[model samples]
Target: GSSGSSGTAHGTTFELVPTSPPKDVTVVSKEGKPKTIIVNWQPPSEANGKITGYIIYYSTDVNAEIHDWVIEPVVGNRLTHQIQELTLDTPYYFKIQARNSKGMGPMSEAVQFRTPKASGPSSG
Candidate 1:
């Protein structure tokens, strides 16, 4: 058998990693790097334990694999993250998973965000 920490926790079955955020995730599009895609989110609604961090998985494909998805390990317990290297005006999909003592939990449903189209020099 694999040797691991065996502690008797007086906790309920509900003790788990975490769930989706209380509110819908927001994407802020503004000027900078041709307007960086800013992702705004809060802690999960069902964070069974102390929120350690998050794992951001983003991609242009809707059915992208976890290994294939672009990874962004979010530390510091911050709720906001910026995606700086994506094609403008194209649809992008992303999701985040909560990390806790229990480990990584289920990720939120995919968020569809279309980065704003860029502005070109139309005038002299």
Candidate 2:
């Protein structure tokens, strides 16, 4: 119980690694090849300390377990990342988790996105 409800917390920016996971995660399909999708997200609106890194986990199975997904550790604090080598015309599910030196936050909500069908002659 420090300050009362007001405009904002007046103090030097405090941090100690992210205390909560990221949220509002989303995905968009790209046309590089019917096998690529872009992942997007925003930092945690709650206790988000100095986020050291982020991870993206994509999978074809909607109910796939943690180990049954493509885990990718990203670089920097970029809010987006590209996921390629995916199956065309198939629904996919992905979740991202942000972590810091403090601890590994929980994964974001699962988002479902389908890769666009190949527009060119790829196969039958």
RMSD of each predicted structure: 6.6, 5.3
Q: How far out, in Å, is residue 122 in model 2?
A: 11
TM-score of 1: 0.75
lDDT of each: 0.73, 0.74
Residue 11 in candidate 2 has what lDDT? 57
Off by over 4 Å in 2: 2-19, 121-124
State the displacement of the C-alpha of residue 57, model 1, in Å, after optimal TM-score superposition.
Answer: 0.8
Q: Give the per-residue lDDT digits (tens) of candidate 1, residues 27-99.
A: 7775645446777787765666777777788888988787788889887877778877678778888887677
- Measured with C-alpha atoms, the lDDT of residue 44 in candidate 1 is 62
Clashing pairs in 2: none
Write one digit per residue (lDDT tens) for candidate 2, span 16-116: 65656677677887754667778888788765556777888877787867888877888886779997676877878888887766666777667777678
